């Protein structure tokens, strides 16, 4: 079986699994589900959700509980149970950093500050955050990560595990960097030539970066640390490896230290890409509920040099519709956090209550992509795709003729598909033209892939999709030529029925149920 690999070409990206583009329709467990006895509280949710990939931690403390004494009993059970359910895995290496801290490091690491030193603040006080300049800390992490990859090289020949996250939400809360003596000698020294050359900057940290020197130095040493662990593992088994970011608010971030300083935040991606060339991608962990902020994050993390992977998102209802713009940007995956029944909710980040209705909000949007996952993945890499979500958030208690026209206008989205445009509208009947009022709660979205100049693959959810010509036609009229509902079977299109009459007179109207359409448009002469 070919190794999984992240391909980047012509500003576009694909996660190759078993030799073809793949989309992670994921779920991540809660943080304490990384034990054989927890797995029975994970699989039922994964099945109800229709997820094709599970993200789950493997902690340094569990595989190396005493220095040099490795224990992979958890990984064995996990691999076997995942294979029985025919799902893939993303392993999350919880090690030097998990949410800025060494809590998942073994006791012999996290209780031995002199061997494995912490960030020191400017006032001499210590924070519970391991210094990225700790050379012993890097050697020890790297050694254990190598043993994990050696386990997968020997025990996972078919690559049940398709990708590994190196650390979890690196960085530091409460300070901008390490101000220890060890760190201060590096800060006061010259910025490395390799970084000065990659950013095309004149050649110390204070000298070249001014007001940003402290935050860029921490981002740099953390990125170098993560890059060395990653090379060490990839030398054993060259799987896709990525880092997940504790995001700063892209519109009003506040100061580094109030957000996790040093992580792959939107102001330091240029440092991260220069310092960590062996890390495949930098992934946003999204817990902003509001459409404008999430849209800004997807825009910031979708780059020619950065495949979009929504490595975590909140598991509350409003988050499910962000799958559509994720995929529309060419994203490789989407992974709601806390999808297990281990009696924990991360509300107010996620759902207040975890039940079947919490799962069902993601299951309903996964049901649109699962039936075409391989076809969609190839179209997003090789061609043109689009995706949108309902752009107004649910009406707040605070907020509850003119405001109705304003909302109808905001709930109307235009997409340029070449010779044709689509107009996507939310929260209206399946007949006539009464203007959009939005879904309660906000939930709708749409996917479109171009098959040919006049032919699109369309699936949507609680929305109307209407096509029209992109450019003024000259003495010509236009019509839908044919709408077919169907499915892909062994890579071939199988028609179930033709949508026509009422089903195409008022756009293409979608409810909560899955329907995959092929839409062929035509301009025709009336001369």
Ligand X SMILES: CN(C)c1cccc2c(S(=O)(=O)NCCCCCC[C@H]3NC[C@@H](O)[C@@H](O)[C@H]3CO)cccc12
Q: Is 338 left (phi over 0), alpha (psi -120 to 50) or beta?
A: left
Interface mask toward Na ion for 10-29; x: CB under 5 A: ---x----------------
Interface mask toward Na ion for 326-365; x: CB under 5 A: ----x-----------------------------------
* Tokens describing residue 517: 């359409």
369-to-40, 217, 451, 458 alpha-carbon distances in Å? 26, 42, 16, 11
Nearer to ligand X, 99 or 412 (CB): 99
The enclosing H or E element of 217 equals helix 213-234
According to DSSP, the β-strands at 412-416 and 420-425 are: antiparallel
Nearer to Na ion, 352 or 513 (CB): 513
Q: What SS3 state is found at 404?
A: helix
CB of 93 to ligand X, least distance (A): 12
Neighbours of 309 (CB within 10 A): 29
According to DSSP, the β-strands at 445-452 and 241-246 are: unpaired
Count of residues near ligand X by CB under 6 A: 12
Residues 37-66 that bind ligand X (CB under 6 A): none
Residue 246's binding partner among Na ion, ligand X, none (Cβ under 5 to 8 angstroms by kind) is ligand X
According to DSSP, the β-strands at 281-286 and 309-313 are: parallel
Residue 412's binding partner among Na ion, ligand X, none (Cβ under 5 to 8 angstroms by kind) is none
Residue 426's binding partner among Na ion, ligand X, none (Cβ under 5 to 8 angstroms by kind) is none
Q: Which of 285, 245, 241, 289 is nearest to 267 (CA)?
A: 245
Residues 390-429 that bind Na ion (CB under 5 A): 416
Residue 380's binding partner among Na ion, ligand X, none (Cβ under 5 to 8 angstroms by kind) is Na ion
Residue 285's binding partner among Na ion, ligand X, none (Cβ under 5 to 8 angstroms by kind) is ligand X
Q: Is 346 a residue that touches ligand X (CB under 6 A)?
A: yes
Q: Which of 312, 314, 331, 166 is nearest to 239 (CA)?
A: 166
Taking the C-alpha atoms of residue 204 and residue 191, their distance in angstroms, rounded to an integer, is 5
Q: Is 31 a residue that touches ligand X (CB under 6 A)?
A: yes
485-to-378, 499, 515, 517 alpha-carbon distances in Å? 20, 7, 6, 4
Q: Is 266 a residue that touches ligand X (CB under 6 A)?
A: no
Sign of CA dihedral 150, 35, 32, 345: positive
Q: Which residue is nearest to ligand X (CB)?
A: 346
CB of 471 to Na ion, least distance (A): 5
Residues 425-484 that bind Na ion (CB under 5 A): 470
Count of residues near Na ion by CB under 5 A: 6
CB of 92 to ligand X, least distance (A): 8
Interface mask toward ligand X for 131-170; x: CB under 6 A: -------------------------------------xx-
Residue of the chain from 39, 161, 222, 246 that contacts ligand X (CB under 6 A): 246
Residue positions counted in the chain? 527
* Cβ atoms 317, 355 nearer than 8 A: no
Nearer to ligand X, 74 or 287 (CB): 287
Residue of the chain from 151, 334, 362, 381 that contacts Na ion (CB under 5 A): 381
Task: Collect all residues with Cβ–Cβ distance below 8 Å to 523 and sequence separation of at least 6.
Answer: 419, 469, 473, 476, 477, 478
CB of 98 to ligand X, least distance (A): 7
Interface with Na ion (CB under 5 A): 13, 330, 380-381, 416, 470
Interface with ligand X (CB under 6 A): 31, 99, 168-169, 246-247, 285, 287, 312, 337, 346, 349
């Amino acid at each position: 079986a070919p190794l999984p690999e992240l391909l980047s070409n012509n500003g576009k990206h694909a996660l190759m699994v078993d030799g073809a583009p793949y989309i992670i329709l994921g779920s991540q467990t809660n943080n304490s589900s990384n034990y054989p006895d927890a797995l029975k509280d994970v699989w039922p949710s994964m099945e109800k959700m229709g997820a094709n990939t599970l993200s789950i931690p493997v902690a340094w403390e569990q595989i190396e509980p005493v220095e040099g004494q490795f224990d992979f009993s958890f990984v064995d059970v996990l691999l076997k149970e995942a294979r029985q359910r025919k799902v893939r895995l993303v392993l999350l290496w919880f090690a030097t950093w998990k949410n800025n801290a060494p809590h998942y490091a073994p006791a012999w690491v996290k209780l031995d500050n002199a061997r494995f030193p912490r960030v020191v603040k400017e006032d001499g006080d210590t924070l519970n955050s391991l210094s990225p300049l700790g050379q012993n800390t890097l050697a020890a992490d790297k050694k254990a990560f190598v043993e994990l990859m050696k386990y997968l090289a020997k025990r996972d020949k078919d690559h049940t595990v398709i990708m590994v996250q190196v650390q979890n939400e690196v960085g530091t809360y409460g300070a901008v960097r390490d101000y220890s003596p060890m760190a201060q000698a590096v800060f006061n020294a010259a910025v490395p030539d390799d970084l000065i050359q990659k950013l095309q900057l004149k050649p110390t940290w204070s000298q070249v970066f001014g007001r940003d020197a402290d935050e860029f130095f921490h981002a740099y040493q953390i990125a170098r640390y993560c890059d060395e662990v990653t090379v060490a593992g990839k030398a054993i088994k060259n799987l896709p490896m990525y880092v997940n970011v504790a995001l700063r608010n892209p519109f009003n971030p506040g100061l580094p230290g109030q957000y996790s300083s040093g992580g792959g935040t939107d102001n330091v991606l240029h440092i991260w890409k220069a310092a960590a060339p062996n890390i495949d991608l930098i992934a946003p962990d999204i817990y902003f509920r509001d459409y404008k902020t999430v849209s800004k994050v997807l825009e910031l993390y979708t780059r020619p040099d950065n495949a979009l992977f929504v490595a975590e998102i909140g598991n509350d209802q409003p988050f499910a519709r962000y799958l559509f713009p994720t995929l529309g940007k060419g994203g490789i995956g989407f992974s709601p956090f806390g999808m297990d029944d281990t009696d924990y909710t991360n509300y107010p980040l996620g759902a207040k209550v975890y039940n079947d209705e919490t799962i069902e909000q993601f299951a309903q949007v996964y049901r649109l992509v699962n039936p075409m996952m391989r076809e969609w993945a190839r179209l997003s890499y090789q061609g043109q795709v689009w995706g949108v979500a309902e752009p107004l958030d649910s009406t707040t208690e605070t907020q509850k003729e003119q405001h109705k026209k304003d909302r109808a206008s905001a709930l109307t989205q235009q997409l340029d598909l070449g010779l044709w445009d689509a107009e996507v509208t939310y929260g209206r009947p399946m007949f006539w033209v009464t203007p959009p009022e939005g879904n309660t709660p906000a939930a709708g979205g749409a996917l479109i892939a171009q098959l040919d100049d006049n032919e699109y693959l369309v699936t949507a959810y609680k929305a109307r999709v209407e096509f029209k010509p992109s450019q003024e036609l000259a003495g010509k009229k236009f019509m839908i030529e044919r709408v077919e509902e169907g499915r892909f079977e062994k890579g071939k299109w199988v028609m179930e029925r033709v949508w026509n009459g009422d089903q195409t007179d008022w756009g293409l109207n979608f409810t909560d149920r899955p329907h995959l359409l092929r839409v062929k448009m035509a301009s025709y002469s009336v001369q």
